[PDB]
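Changelog entry

Holo records now carry the ligand SMILES as an explicit input line rather than a separate metadata file. Below, a converted record for magnesium ion, shown in the new format.
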Amino acid sequence: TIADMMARPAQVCVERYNRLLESLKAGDINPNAETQMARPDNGDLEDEEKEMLAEARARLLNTQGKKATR
RNA sequence: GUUCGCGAAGUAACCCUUCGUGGACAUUUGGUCAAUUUGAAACAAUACAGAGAUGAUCAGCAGUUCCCCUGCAUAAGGAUGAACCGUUUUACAAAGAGAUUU
Ligand SMILES: [Mg+2]
Ligand SMILES: [Mg+2]
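Structure line, unchanged by the conversion:
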């Protein structure tokens, strides 16, 4: 409700509230992973990520049906 | 062929026959169409695939069409019945700038 009143995402609101009132281990599941910052990648790529971008370009390419391709 | 006569001949006698002869009755069917190849139904078999919006598998309702089929149909089916998916240029003008000619 508060984040709706401020037109800001709620995770930003919670962390900034913690910063106002102030003045993770390994092997845990992070529930807040979608709201958190991304991880940039190692220089070459992983193999599964090469496969992912290949099939992603292949699925973003096609704009036809079965009848039209035939 | 029937019927009403009108004459001759046979027996006649008023009938019954052969024969000629005038009238009456009855009066135009059928084809749009000829009997095996050359004037027009079509499917089915061998071969290939194995159904639209899909990443995959499907329910469908429509629409437009000089395509229709099954159906008693103005119902409903036929893969949502199917074809639909391509090719794409001019009602062409205004202001400014740079070179050629007068
Ligand atoms: Mg249809
Ligand atoms: Mg139908």
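Spot-checked after migration. The CA atoms of residues 17 and 23 of chain A lie 10 Å apart. The longest helix of chain A spans residues 47-61.
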